[PDB]
Write a protein that binds this DNA or RNA. Structure first.
Lengths: 797, 65, 122
RNA sequence: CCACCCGAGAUUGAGCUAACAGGUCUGUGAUGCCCUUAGAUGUCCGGGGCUGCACGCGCGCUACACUGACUGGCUCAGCGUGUCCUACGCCGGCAGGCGCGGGUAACCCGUUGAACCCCAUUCGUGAUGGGGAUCGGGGAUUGCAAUUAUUCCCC
């Protein structure tokens, strides 16, 4: 095998190698088979071996299985006429009733169609002849051994036929789709799953990439579009009352067909929607979610105009009864409209909403409060569709003019809907300013929406934060000159002494929103105005000032970045000067501002960071959880920043540590501060800080395990947990005994209160080492807790 | 983490099945009508009730449960 | 041009290969009359004798037979022959003819088309 | 579930080895008695027995036959197996030996080549050739050993 792979008489040597496949020894036969496979795949000898195939199969009851195994391994490397003759041989041997030879032949077809042979090996005409020759078997419906691989091999064959010539493949596909629908009546769930997977894969790979070439299909199609419509009617006639068991699979197949083909298959697709609406009218339908997903996929592919032409909403104004049968269509439209036109939303959903709201108010003022609530909920539901319509509009350059004044009035004097309108605006922006004329129209109406939103946010009492987020993004998408004008007006309103505190705070929030969207001169003037406010005794004014400083330093590029590199020295001086008089809430944004000036800090700035260190640690033990998160992130950030000031990372980390080491010496709360800081640093700089040094810190933690204060003990336990998680078991084994001895002589009350942390620590130690060692070296009572860990290791399995 | 308590569950089910009409979508309006409706011991229980009923009226007004 | 069906009875399965032929019914290389249980040879010929000799003039059926005993064996063979005729006249011949022969077969014996669902209980 | 805006607070502090009938098992007594060339079955060696048979109560196998028995021919399975399961040839009446191969297993046994059943011959209503025990001789395996028949084969 090796010699023939490496290299008239060569044909004789190959014949001598080939002729002993039928040798009865399982080891000789397998070696010869693998040798022939390695020689052919490593060809002028394919004709001779294929002739040997046909001849000694025709001469032959156990060698046929072995020879069909070689046919499985060797069909792709055969010439076209020999492929045809071997295929005829496989049909001749599956004319017999033997299950094993038929299984080997269909597995050979699986390996032939799976490798995707070229035009020289398998042509389109030969593939079609082989595929149509395979339609004579289908023994019954429910054999479950040959059926799954059966439709698998002509799944692969249909994929190959589409790959060779797409129009013929699409033409022959739908009758196979009909046979798949027919064999979805099998009592075995595996047949249903295989059919669903095969049809889904065929629709995704063979039909979906040719979506544009086929074009729109109607009821009078001629070419492959008719084939598209005809496996559509196959899968749609697979929705009748014959199944009652495959409806989830048929709904999934409908969903993937809608996603594949709806945009050009819409003229014929309506009756499927009518039947799907009729199925949901059943008393007890367990496939409600699957049907809703299928209808949502149809809506996503097409859009609600043709869907409502097919299955209309019966909530058009005045109804007689109170049980709306198609009330699920509005959640479907809300959840699944993404690529439709806004003009349909206007011209269909605005007057209907106005009439329903008027009817609800007229019924509410007439005494009936049950129908009015239903109508108000209905109009709220059908005007939550606007974020769906604002997903990807195709005519928002011409239809947004028809909604500007309406949305302005609705965000002015309609509070219960306001958030959704805000959300809709945000949703529109977040995925609708891809083009330039669209963004120009949004700016041209932004110059009108801005006073309305500012007056809405500045009113006394309201959903202020949704309006604020809308203002933030909506001002990131607008021109800078009007931003400068409104920033000047907001600075005038802030500096005016005749304003109330609530108004001052609201205009400071507007200043926060307007700060990152201005130019460098306006940002510098705003920074000069806000700089004296950092020492104000009011915590709110200082908080908004630090939020302004955080927002102007947040942008990585733009006028804010140029302002940062222009005024870094003054910013450092001011932030170091205002350290002493910072209020407790104002710690939370300020750290972020410091964060925003650490990531782009130059090498000559060690004094600033080593002066900021105790503030950051005291903020790691701040009251606010957001301040703690910001201080931990800032510690990680300056740890990263010292990894840029020197060539050796480990030495820089050691310097960063000896800048924070004395904090374990001072006050008790400062000791707990430093232990928590080292605990957070140990989880991020695991090996780079140096294992032996870890051990030293661990030893110090054991001394801090002797402290009376509960906070220091808790922080030490957290550090020990992080160290056991992080540093190596070989390095642990030198220092198990000392830390567990320090744990053992803790206290009675300290052990009783912190029983869960000690339990988890003993669990980690027993998992990482022997149970008997920790059993021996601990004192008496701890033994009981120790043994409990064992059944976890026994009964988590 | 945080989980809802069963007493809050049963009390909010009573409030939903009894007086859904005057309930709305705003948090504080729901809280004040809730403290108007029932016999009520505690502030924190009231606020948990108000938050839970507000979230489930965000839920059920999309579709029935 | 050809169909392949099976007939099951207990364990015995007989696969019938039906083709447009010249009027030969071959069962494992042997004709119907030269199957060994000649006491029970009429059951194997009941479709052929009952339905007549007429339209069997161009039908070639090769039956490959495996498993079971002798009585269940010949019943599986005869039900496979009947099902092969039904399937062939369903596929390549008109609908009403196969409906008619199904009506006659069900009118004579129900087991000629459907198999016995009961089998050896553990 | 995560992150974030607002908010003073989106989690900062206090209290909670003990209980089990949930399972189940050989540690602590200077524990009460009784025994210890009267070994709480002391170790090994050789040979027997568990089948022995007048009799009762019962599980099963084979039958009393003609719907049978003998002879020849015919054709169909599954649960399971194996480093002792066996494929092939020779010597063989015949159990079995001899030379050779596979299988640590949907592969080799093994298309598991079954038996009643069917198709032909003879027997012909009697302790019959039905039914086969109980005995007499030889032969061949299994095993250190077949004598109290181990087992099977031929009259």
């Amino acid at each position: 095998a090796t010699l023939l792979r490496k290299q008239p008489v060569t044909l004789q040597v190959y014949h001598g190698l080939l002729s002993f496949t039928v040798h009865p020894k399982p080891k000789i036969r397998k070696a010869a088979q693998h040798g022939v496979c390695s020689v052919l795949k490593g060809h002028p000898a394919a004709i001779s071996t294929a002739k040997f195939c046909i001849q000694e199969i025709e001469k032959s009851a156990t060698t046929t299985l072995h020879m069909l195994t070689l046919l499985k391994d060797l069909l792709p490397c055969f010439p076209e006429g020999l492929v045809k003759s071997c295929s005829e041989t496989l049909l001749r041997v599956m004319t017999l009733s033997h299950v094993l030879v038929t299984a080997c032949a269909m597995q050979a077809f699986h390996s032939l169609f799976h490798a995707r042979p070229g035009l020289s090996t398998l042509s389109a005409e030969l593939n079609a002849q082989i595929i149509t020759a395979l339609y004579d078997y289908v023994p019954s419906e429910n054999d479950l051994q040959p059926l799954l691989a059966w439709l698998k091999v002509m799944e692969k064959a249909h994929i190959n036929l589409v790959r060779l010539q797409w129009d013929l493949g699409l033409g022959h596909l739908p009758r196979f789709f009909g046979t798949a629908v027919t064999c979805l009546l099998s009592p075995h769930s595996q047949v249903l799953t295989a059919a669903t997977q095969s049809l889904k894969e065929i629709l995704k790979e063979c039909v979906a990439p040719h979506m544009a070439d086929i074009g729109s299909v109607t009821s009078s199609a001629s070419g492959p579009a008719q084939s598209v419509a005809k496996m559509f009617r196959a899968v749609e006639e697979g929705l009748t009352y014959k199944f009652h068991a495959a409806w989830s699979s048929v709904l999934q197949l409908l969903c993937v067909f809608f996603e594949a083909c709806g945009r050009q298959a819409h003229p014929v697709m309506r009756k499927c929607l009518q039947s799907l609406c009729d199925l949901r009218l059943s008393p007890h339908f367990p496939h409600t979610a699957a049907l809703d997903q299928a209808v949502g996929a149809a809506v996503t592919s097409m859009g609600p105009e043709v869907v409502l032409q097919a299955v209309p909403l019966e909530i058009d104004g005045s109804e007689e009864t109170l049980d709306f049968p198609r009330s699920w269509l509005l959640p479907v439209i809300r959840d699944h409209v993404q690529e439709t036109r806004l003009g349909f939303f206007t011209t269909y959903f605005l007057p209907l909403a106005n009439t329903l709201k008027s009817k609800a108010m007229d019924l509410a003022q007439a005494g009936s409060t049950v129908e009015s609530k239903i109508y108000d909920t209905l109009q709220w539901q059908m005007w939550t569709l606007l974020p769906g319509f604002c997903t990807r509009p195709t005519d928002v350059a011409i239809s947004f003019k028809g909604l500007a004044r309406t949305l302005g009035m609705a965000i002015s004097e309609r509070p219960d809907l306001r958030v959704t309108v805000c959300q809709a605006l945000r949703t529109l922006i977040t995925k609708g300013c891809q083009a330039e004329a669209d963004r120009a129209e949004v700016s041209r109406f932004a110059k009108n929406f801005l006073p309305i939103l500012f007056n809405l946010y500045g009113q006394p009492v309201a959903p202020r934060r949704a309006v604020l987020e809308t203002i933030r993004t909506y001002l990131t998408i607008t021109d800078t000159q009007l931003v400068n004008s409104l920033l000047e007006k907001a600075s005038e309103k802030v500096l005016d002494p005749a304003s109330s505190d609530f108004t001052r705070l609201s205009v400071l929030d507007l200043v926060v929103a307007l700060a990152p969207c201005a130019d460098e001169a306006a940002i510098s003037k705003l920074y000069s105005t806000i700089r004296p406010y950092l020492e104000s005794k009011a915590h709110g004014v200082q908080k908004k000032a630090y939020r302004v400083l955080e927002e102007v330093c947040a942008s990585p590029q733009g006028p804010g970045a140029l302002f940062v590199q222009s005024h870094l020295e003054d910013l450092k001086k001011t932030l170091l000067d205002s350290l002493r008089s910072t209020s407790s809430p104002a710690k939370r944004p300020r750290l972020k501002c410091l964060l925003h000036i650490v990531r782009k800090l130059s090498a000559e700035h060690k004094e600033f960071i080593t002066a900021l260190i105790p503030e950051v640690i005291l903020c790691t033990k701040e009251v606010s959880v957001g301040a703690r998160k910001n201080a931990f992130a800032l510690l990680v950030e300056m740890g990263h920043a010292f990894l840029r000031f020197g060539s050796n990372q480990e030495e820089a980390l050691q310097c960063y540590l000896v800048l924070i080491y004395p904090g374990l010496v001072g006050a008790v709360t400062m000791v707990s501060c430093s232990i928590l800081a080292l605990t957070h640093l140990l989880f991020e700089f695991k090996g780079l800080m140096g294992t032996s040094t870890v051990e030293q810190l661990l030893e110090n933690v054991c001394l801090l395990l002797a402290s009376r204060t509960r906070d220091v003990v808790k922080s030490a336990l957290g550090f020990i947990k992080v160290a056991v998680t992080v540093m190596d078991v070989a390095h642990l084994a030198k220092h198990v005994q000392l830390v567990m001895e320090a744990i053992g002589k803790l206290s009675d009350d300290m052990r009783r209160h912190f029983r869960m942390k000690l339990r988890n620590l003993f669990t980690k130690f027993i998992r990482k080492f022997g149970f008997e060692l920790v059993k021996r070296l601990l004192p008496e009572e701890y033994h009981r807790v120790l043994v409990n860990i064992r059944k976890a290791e026994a009964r988590a399995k | 983490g945080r989980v809802r308590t069963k007493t809050v569950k049963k009390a909010a089910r009573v409030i939903i099945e009894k007086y859904y009409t005057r309930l709305g979508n705003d948090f504080h309006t729901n809280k004040r009508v809730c403290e108007e409706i029932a016999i009520i011991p505690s502030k924190k229980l009231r606020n948990k009730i108000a938050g839970y009923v507000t979230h489930l009226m965000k839920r059920i007004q999309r579709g029935p449960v | 041009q050809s169909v392949q069906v099976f007939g099951r009875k207990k364990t015995a399965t007989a696969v019938a290969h039906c083709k447009r032929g010249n009027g030969l019914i071959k069962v494992n290389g042997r004709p119907l009359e030269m199957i060994e249980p000649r006491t029970l040879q009429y059951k194997l010929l009941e479709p052929v004798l009952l339905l007549g000799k007429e339209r069997f003039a161009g039908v070639d059926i090769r039956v490959r037979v495996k498993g079971g005993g002798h009585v269940a064996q010949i019943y599986a063979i005869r039900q496979s022959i009947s099902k092969a005729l039904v399937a062939y006249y369903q596929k390549y011949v008109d609908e009403a003819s196969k409906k008619e022969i199904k009506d006659i077969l069900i009118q004579y014996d129900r087991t000629l088309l459907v198999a016995d669902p009961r089998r050896c209980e553990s």
